[PDB]
Every structure is written in C-alpha cells, then in structure tokens.
Design a protein around this ligand. Sequence first.
Ligand SMILES: Cc1ncc(C[n+]2csc(CCOP(=O)(O)OP(=O)(O)O)c2C)c(N)n1
Ligand SMILES: Cc1ncc(C[n+]2csc(CCOP(=O)(O)OP(=O)(O)O)c2C)c(N)n1
Ligand SMILES: O=P(O)(O)OC[C@H]1O[C@@H](O)[C@H](O)[C@@H]1O
Ligand SMILES: O=P(O)(O)OC[C@H]1O[C@@H](O)[C@H](O)[C@@H]1O
Ligand SMILES: [Mg+2]
Ligand SMILES: [Mg+2]
Lengths: 632, 632
Amino acid sequence: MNIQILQEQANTLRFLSADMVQKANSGHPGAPLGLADILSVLSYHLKHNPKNPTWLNRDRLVFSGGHASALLYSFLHLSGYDLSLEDLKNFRQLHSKTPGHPEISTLGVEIATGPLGQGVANAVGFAMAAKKAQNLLGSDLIDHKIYCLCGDGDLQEGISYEACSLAGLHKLDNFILIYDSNNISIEGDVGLAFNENVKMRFEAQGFEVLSINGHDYEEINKALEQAKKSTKPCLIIAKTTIAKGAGELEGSHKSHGAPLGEEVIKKAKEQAGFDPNISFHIPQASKIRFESAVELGDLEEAKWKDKLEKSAKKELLERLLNPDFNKIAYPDFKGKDLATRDSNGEILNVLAKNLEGFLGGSADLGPSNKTELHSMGDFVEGKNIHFGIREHAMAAINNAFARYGIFLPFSATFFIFSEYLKPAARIAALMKIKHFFIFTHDSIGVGEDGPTHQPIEQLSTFRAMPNFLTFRPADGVENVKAWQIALNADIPSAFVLSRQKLKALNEPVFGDVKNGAYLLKESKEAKFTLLASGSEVWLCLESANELEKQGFACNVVSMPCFELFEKQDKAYQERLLKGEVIGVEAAHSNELYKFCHKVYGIESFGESGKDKDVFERFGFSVSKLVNFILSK
Amino acid sequence: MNIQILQEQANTLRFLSADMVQKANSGHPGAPLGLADILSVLSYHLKHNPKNPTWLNRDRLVFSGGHASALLYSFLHLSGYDLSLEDLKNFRQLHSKTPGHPEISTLGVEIATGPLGQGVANAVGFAMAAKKAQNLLGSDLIDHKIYCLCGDGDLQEGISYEACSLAGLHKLDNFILIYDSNNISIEGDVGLAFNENVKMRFEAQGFEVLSINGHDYEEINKALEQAKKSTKPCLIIAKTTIAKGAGELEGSHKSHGAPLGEEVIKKAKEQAGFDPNISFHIPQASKIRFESAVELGDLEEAKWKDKLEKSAKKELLERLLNPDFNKIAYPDFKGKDLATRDSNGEILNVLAKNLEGFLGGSADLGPSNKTELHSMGDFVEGKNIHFGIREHAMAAINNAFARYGIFLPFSATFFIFSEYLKPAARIAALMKIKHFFIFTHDSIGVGEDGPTHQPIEQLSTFRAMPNFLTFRPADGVENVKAWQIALNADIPSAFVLSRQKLKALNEPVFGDVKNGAYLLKESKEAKFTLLASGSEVWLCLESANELEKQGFACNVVSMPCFELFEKQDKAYQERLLKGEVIGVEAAHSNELYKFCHKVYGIESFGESGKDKDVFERFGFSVSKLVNFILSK
Ligand SMILES: Cc1ncc(C[n+]2csc(CCOP(=O)(O)OP(=O)(O)O)c2C)c(N)n1
Ligand SMILES: Cc1ncc(C[n+]2csc(CCOP(=O)(O)OP(=O)(O)O)c2C)c(N)n1
Ligand SMILES: O=P(O)(O)OC[C@H]1O[C@@H](O)[C@H](O)[C@@H]1O
Ligand SMILES: O=P(O)(O)OC[C@H]1O[C@@H](O)[C@H](O)[C@@H]1O
Ligand SMILES: [Mg+2]
Ligand SMILES: [Mg+2]
C-alpha cells in the first residue's frame, strides 16, 4: 500500500471504465473516473470473498449511483469475481453480464440500482438487517460494514433523507456513506438546484461527518480508518472532479452521460503512462494487487466458518437459511365474517411465530393496517419495525432485508399510499425477491376519509407491473391460501385488503385460489358469469341468486389474483368464463376486459361519506348490478 | 387582542371541531384541539377576503395535515367564507361541502391535502409562484405570505425535505412553516421513529428557526411577528399537546383518529366555561371577532385594486388571467421524422413565447427531456426552473403554481420516474388543474440504460388514473394536436414521448387526434385492424402493407389517447374497429382489451441493449407481428 501502486490501480479502473463506455458508444464515464481513487483505496478495506458472493458476513458494497456501473464491473473483474474481460467488452449489449445499470443476476452485485436514492436507502437497510442478524446470531458471527457510494442526485431525492433519518435513530455504526461531491449533474453546476449545508444536515440526523479530497490517497485512507471506528453512522464528503484524468472533459457536465471520445482517452492514457493504442489493458502490478482479494477473502471466510462451527447459533442459522413453509398451521377462517385487514393481521402473527426470520412493519399505520406482531417486541431486540411516515424508504429498506440472506420482510401501508413506495416495489419485482407488501384500505369502502384515501387505479398498476402477484382476497380463507402461494412463489406479492368487514364465502366448486380465479357457483348452460375479487364477490353471489330467481343460469367466479389467472390454460379459463362475462370490481380496472365482455367498475375518483352511502352512490348494489347485467 | 378573547376564540374552534367529529362518528379531533390556539392567533395576522377567495394577493394558508380538516372548516365558517353551520353538521357525509380531507370545491380551500408531505411542498410552491408573480407584476402588487401548518407526519416524508431544500436555495422569505410538534403519531410516541434535531435540519437548508409553546398566546404572536420579518424561509417549531383541552385524552394517541366521546366533550366544555348540553355553539364575542375578517378583507382587497389601477402591469395581468390559446401558431411537423421528445421541446418553446404565464422545468433532465426554454432565462427572472433530482416535490410545487392564479406549469422527467411523483400527479387529477406532465424515454426503445429505465406498466397507471389524459403521440403533428387538446381541456394531461427518432405519418383518413383514436388506413371489408400508439404506429403501417400484399384487407388505427377514445360514440368506434382488432404497444397494456381482440405487448421487464436489438428481442418487427396476426 503506497502511492505508485494506488495510482496505477486507480488508473486501471479509469481506463477499463472509459474503454467499456467507448466500445458500447453508450454510458457514463464521468463518475467512474471521479470515483476511481476512492474505490482503489476502498479495495484495501473491503472484506469480501470474490469466489463466494453469498458469504453472510461480507462487507456489503452498494453503488447508489448505478450509472457508475462500468466502475463496479471493472472492480468485480479485477478482484476475481465471475465476470470476465470479454464480459467487460460487451458492456451494455443485449444479454451481456454487464448491463447499463447493475442487476443482481451479475454475481457480486448486492442490489439493483439505477433509480437515484434507492441505493442509499438500501444501504441503510443492509445496516439494519446486519444489526438484526447480530441480535440473532451474536457479534462473533456478524460484524461487517456497509459501504455506499452516492452522488449529488441520490442526496437530493427524498428517500435519502428518509432513510438517513432512520440510520441516525438506530445508531447504525456499521454504515459508511461516501458522497461523491463533484458539483456536477446533468443540468450542470449543482448550485443551480442545491446548496444545503450537507454536514449540518447529516449531523442533524445523528451522523459523524468527515470531509476529504477524494483524489488524495492518504486522506481517503485516513477517513476510512476513522469511519470504521465511528460510534455513529458516518458520511464521508469526498470532493472530486468529474472525469478526473480526462483532460478537457475534467469538471464538464458533458462527461456525465456520453463517451469521452477516442482522442480524449488517448491523451488521458498518455498522461497516466498507459499505452494509448491498446484498450482493456490491465497492468501487472495492478492485476496481482486487485486479485489478491481472492486469497484474502478465502481466508476471511474460512476464519468465519470456524467461528460458526463453535457457535451456539448454527442450528438457528440453518433454520433461517432453509425455512419450512409447508409445516405452518394457518388460522382457519372458514365461515367467519371479517375485514381482510384483520384476517391478514392474524396470519402475520402466525408467520412471525413460525419463522424466526419473518419481520417487518408499517409506515406509522400498525394499528390501522393490523400488522403489529403481538408480544414480539420492537426492533432491534424484537420483530416490529416502526418505519415512521416513510413509505418509500420502508420499501427500499425492506428490499435490502430481503437480499441480506436470512430475512422474510413485510412492508405495510394503506393501498392508496403504495404510490409513495412504487419505485422500490418495482426494484423488488425486477430482482424477483421475496418481499411482501401489505396494502389495507383497498377501495371506496374506506368511506369518510374521502377520495384522497380511496384507491381507484392502484390495482391496475400492480397488476401491470411484471413479476409481482397482486392478491385481493375475498375472505380469510382466500387470504391464507394467498400467503401459502406467496411464500412458495419466486416473485414478490402484494396483499390488497379491506377496512370493512367482508362476508365469508362458501367452498370452491371447481379450481382454487392457486389458479388465480375459480368457481364459487357453477350452472349448466350458464347465460352469465359474474367475475369479481375481494369485497365485490358477495355482491356477485347475491346478484347471481337474483338472476337465477329471474330465470337466468349464472356462474360466479372469484378472482383473488389476476396474474395467476393469466397463466392458466385455455381449458381451465373456458370452463370458468361462460356466456356473457361481467367483471365487477371497486376499481378502475380496464385490464378485466382480458377476461370479461363487460366491466362494472369505478371510472371517477371517490367521495367522502359513510361506506354504505359511497358504495350505493357508485352503483355497488344488487338492484343496480342486476339492471346493468340485464341491460335495462 | 387579549387573553380572554383569544381563549374563547380557540375554545370555539375546539368545540366546533370536536362536535363535528362526534356527529359524524368519524374523523380527527386531536390535531384540531392542538392547533386551536395557534390558528386563533394566526387569524389576526392572515390577510384574506372571505368574500373573494380568488383575491390574487391574499395570504395563502395550507393545512398540510389535511386530517385537521374540521379545524379548517370551523375557521372558514367563523371567518365569513361561504360555508355554513349546517355544512359543519354534515362533516364527512356524502355530498357535503365538508369532506374528511379538504378539497378545492369547498371555497376557501387553497389546495387539496390528505396525503402527508404534499402540503408542505405545495406551500413552497405557492411561495415560489408568489416570487415569480412579484417578478412579473412588481412588489407593489404581490407581497403576501404563505402559511403552512404541518405535523410530524409531514416532516418525516421525503417530499418535505425536497421542497424545503428548494425553499432555502431560493431564499423564500415569504414562506412561514408552522410545525405542530406534539410528539404523537398513530403508532404513539414519535420517538419510536424520529429523533432528528429539527432546528439543525432546517438551518442546514437555509431556514430561520423559532421555537415556541403553541398554547401560549403571546409567544405565538411574537413568533409570527418575527417570522413575518424574516429574511429567510421561517419554521416555527410549536410544541403542543395533542387534544389540548380534552382531559383524559390530552397527549393520547387515541385522540388522533377517533371521536373524543360524548362525556369527554361534556367535561371539556365545563372546564372551558361552555355549556356541555349544547353543540355547535358559537359565543357572541368570538363570532363578532372572527367575522371581522369580512370587513377587513374587503378593505384590504379594495386598497389592492386601487394599486392595480395605478399599475403599469394591468394589461399583463389581464393576459395572464385570460390566455388566448387559439391564436398560437404551432410548428408544422408534417413529413418530418423526429423523436417526439424533440418535437415536444419545440412546442414547449412556442408555448413559452406565446404565454407569459407558461413556465416549468425538469428534474435535472432538461438536456435529455428537451425541455429547456431557450433564451428565456432561469427562475426567478426567467422561466426555466431547475428542480434538481426531486421529481415528487417538483410535481407538488407545480400543483401549487397551477392553483396560484396566473401560471401554466409543466413538470418533466423520464416516464419511468413518473412513479416518483405519481402521488402529486394524482392530486392534480383530483383538483382538475391545468398542470402538464412531460414524460420522455417512454419504452424499451430507451435501449442501453436497461430495465430500470424502461417503462412497462406506467401507461396502464396513467390511463387508469381518472381526470388525466395520457397522450402518446406517434409524430410531431400528433404532438401538436395533443397540446391543442390539453390546453383546452378541463383536466391535466401527460405527454409520453420517445427517446428515439420516429417516422412521420400520412394524414388522417377519418377522425383525428381529438377523437383519441383515428384511422390512418381504411379498407373496405377489413379482416384485421391494427391499433397502436406512439412508436408502434409505423410497425403497424408496415405490417398492414405486408398483410395487404398477402391478400388481407386491413385498417390501421392510431390511438394517441386512450381516455379520449373511451368517450367516443358507438358509431365512431365501430367504423374504426373492424374485423379482428390487434393492439400493439411497447407496454404491458391489458387495458387495450377494451378495444382489441388480441394484444401484442410486453409482459416482462426490459433488457439492456441497443434499441434495435431490444425491440427485435421483444418481438417488435414486421415479420413477427404479421406471424402473430396470422396465428402462425
Ligand atoms: C430517481 C431518478 N431520477 C432521475 C434519474 C436520471 N439521472 C441519471 S444520473 C442523474 C444525475 C446525476 O447526478 P449525480 O448524482 O450528481 O451524478 P454525476 O453527474 O456526479 O455522475 C440523473 C438525474 C435517475 N437515474 N433516477
Ligand atoms: C403519505 C401518507 N401516509 C400515511 C398517511 C396516514 N396518516 C394519516 S395522519 C397520519 C399520522 C399523523 O401523524 P401526525 O402528523 O403527527 O398527526 P397528529 O397525530 O399530530 O394528528 C398518518 C400516518 C397519510 N395521510 N399520508
Ligand atoms: O379506522 P381506521 O381506518 O383504522 O383509521 C383511519 C386512519 O386513517 C387516517 O384517516 C387517520 O389517521 C385514521 O387513524
Ligand atoms: O441520450 P440521453 O437518453 O438523452 O441520455 C441518457 C441519460 O440518462 C441517464 O442514463 C444518464 O444520466 C444519461 O445522461
Ligand atoms: Mg455529481
Ligand atoms: Mg404529531
């Protein structure tokens, strides 16, 4: 560890990054060049095993500025991860292992980033998760750091403030945040849009704040040493020059987001002592020094595995890693009228009791979402997490809990406020992680709180989002079966739950919840089929009885999950969907036309009133639905 | 102005609020009771005309904690606004003027609130708008204050930090923020989730911070006096007790969100000297004192109208209030191949030149969204607003610009990051305000930036949202006609625009953009109709040519706006939608089943690659679409 080696290392990172962007004719060279000195030093402090990216006590590295991907990829390649030089040469190309922003399918990537702010919140979540894992497994087994690299953009996003608020409160002295302060964004000087006293901001949230030149190797190293000893979450404010090393592009906003150009790279390499007529060159000293992570990480993991073998907590870790969902005895809600917020809250309690790694909480709405895990304590000693009024950061935090390696997290709020966390929900879908979203107060049934609190379009959004199951159970029994699917599935799920009491259903006649839709009533030569979800299923059962009394044979279909029904074969769908099919939902859900000839929905916003008054106003009554179905 | 009158006034506000909640058996009495002393004093400082809620230079009052509605309504009633005592007795009832959270259809309500955080951001926007209005009209005509009441919940939301960041940067010394610091939220003690040094936080963002007892009338009054003289945006941290005055419920979380109960109200009234056996009682001194706002506000407005008549800026104000959209000469893009981000950016420039009140900006993406208004300067002297990486606050800010009274605002970002601002977009829809959303980079056509940057489900979301037009123009000409509709419509619109170059269309054969969908190609006895929007329309024109060469008559339908097409009559829809109708869109857009027998979409997330490689991978090619249409 000396200046000549660190300089060559940093420059190696620079020109791999620069050459990658240039070959793709696409990407972001500025931030890589600006961060290259920092990551060169950080490589000496990071504890990780390139050959086992799943090692539980590794330091977690997050690039919150995901546009800096070329740098990450360079570093994973150089350090010994399963990413090749040829992979680097296919940066940004279809089906490569080096996509434009980082994805977890590339080994070594902790969490997908790209949407700004998420990664900072993810890093706080990894730090919380680590403090919980320490609670469960002991500080002999869990003691690692969480390093996050962020930029101007990340810190302007609300979610950064939310998550850092929580990091201060919980005294996350395992969290180190490195701010790339280069005074440049896409619109140019960051002073056009931002002039906070960042040090004072973070100290207000309980951080220790260090301030460095991010191109001075000794200063970087001294800050990391001091940060690792902090009794607070720690922010390093690293002053850097965007595209450091790229001559005429140093400090230029034009370097943020477009290739540096062949002649600029040629000059840069000349000034650093690199041959300008070759690309993707790794000098020898740098190569050996970066790849020494392989031997060192192997040894650190072995030393840890020895501590595990002596630990009283081996059996526990194996249950966390291998949860048994099939043994769980769920509540039996058959014939019980209940609001599905209530059935779901009982289910949450059963899961928390059966699964040592199942935990979560609400965004200040525990008592209304019914998500309190009774007698299970408050984080960190217990399982209930009090996220505050921070839906977005809650979801990003729990995305990281779900990636940590031993946790099954849930996030809760009113379904209307799913919109505040939707970007993080999307990253859960993109990753295909097991993170459960609990959304109560699902419709105009909310009543008096009025239109700003009554979901209309949210079901469409979550249904349209790929890799994401949206369950809307009609009763407790459907709510159970939904959980059983959710825990076994390979993608995240949301639970869309009522404020108001719903009526228990009769048993399936054909199919079940696992088919997405199923028959509750089946009639030979059916003229109509009424298809509904959640709170609208009883309206449909009643309306079908009235239709039958009038001489019209009817099928009634419960559809607790649209996405699962889409996956059913033709023969199944044909048996359910007979005659003229009418879909009925307290939502604006045009997607139902995929399965329905007519849709009886809500096309406007809601109203403030008693639930029974609002449902009647919006047409959710037997007499009105039967008149629609009979077209008169 | 003395203690006995202020106490009676505050208690009048308390018991109207409490009695309203009790009669509804629904609502939030805690915050009203806690804020009642503050608003009693604030009533002496507020400049407003109850009989003309549109007076341009009124002080703007925002209740960011919209759950405190009962208090607002009590105050509007008492002050002389067109809200009656009978209206108060129908709190939270279907079709009343006193819905559970405030709505702009109730005169005197500045902006709809309810979703926490929005109002604080709205208040910053009203303060920016006021600084712009001052730039245009002079400080002789615009000099008012913006008062915002907020709670714990508002300040935990990210959007509060975003908006206050901007308030500091822009030195909004017309903005006064009153924080109801009662240490209680729904989950109880706020310390469970939040322990920031709030003073230090705000000072880091450029605020002056005062700290008071919010039940001491002289302290409240002295803070307001000092706040009105601040050279900074100012925060008053007002320590209050939730449900102050309600005995056993003082300081209780149970008072947040449920009626206080008849016996608690009886005691409260006894202790305050009010008769406990009557409800909705306004004592005489309080009545006369509150309603004096009528005479005083009339006089303040008259004095202002005199200043207007002497002003050089009368003609300008009349053009701002009465924009003439029909005279605008738009660019003629007929036959020109362009990315619609580019056509739209030319249109933005034309509008900014023709409309003195048209302004806006991007969330750090001006150069990529193509929204820079060239040669028009930077806010406040000019029209370009640099919002930073703050999509959510941008939208909430611009919602307030749209309510200020003289502005036509636009908000811009990548369509994928519409998800960060969607809750504010919703409030624009709920209010039916003229606020324009510019969303570029609309699909997998984005290419290399990959799946976190490629919209899939966002079209469904915006289509499903009521009162919101979603235009996805196929070329420059469609982009123009979309703007022409948008400016004349009574609801907000989004523009969904491409990164990549699109091909100019031939002229409509039947119908036009104003019908939402229209024919580009019409064939007698058509066997198929290919229906598309935006970038997919040329794929459809080409595929229809290939189908015709194979012997199949085809109609091609461009659908730049789904919502407008939904409103067309039967006869129009029937002429367009002939034979088997196939919808084609680079989105997961199941809503198309409303108009299409088959849908050829994207059902997964995207991929990082060259645009032509990704489109081919996802099946957007003539050969693949023709093979689907011919089912083989
Ligand atoms: C939520 C969000 N909004 C917008 C963007 C678009 N975007 C990509 S990088 C960037 C700004 C980069 O600023 P900074 O973090 O200062 O990066 P640097 O210029 O220093 O590379 C933006 C706005 C994004 N990725 N995420
Ligand atoms: C964005 C958002 N999330 C959640 C809620 C639900 N909600 C209503 S009031 C409230 C908390 C109230 O806390 P505070 O502002 O401290 O109000 P107080 O208890 O002092 O009345 C919440 C979480 C909401 N209205 N908006
Ligand atoms: O009866 P629930 O819906 O559980 O309570 C509704 C809550 O939602 C918000 O309006 C209030 O904050 C209130 O506490
Ligand atoms: O060519 P465009 O799409 O305009 O630039 C793309 C931008 O989007 C982000 O990935 C980068 O920040 C880059 O500048
Ligand atoms: Mg920067
Ligand atoms: Mg509070």
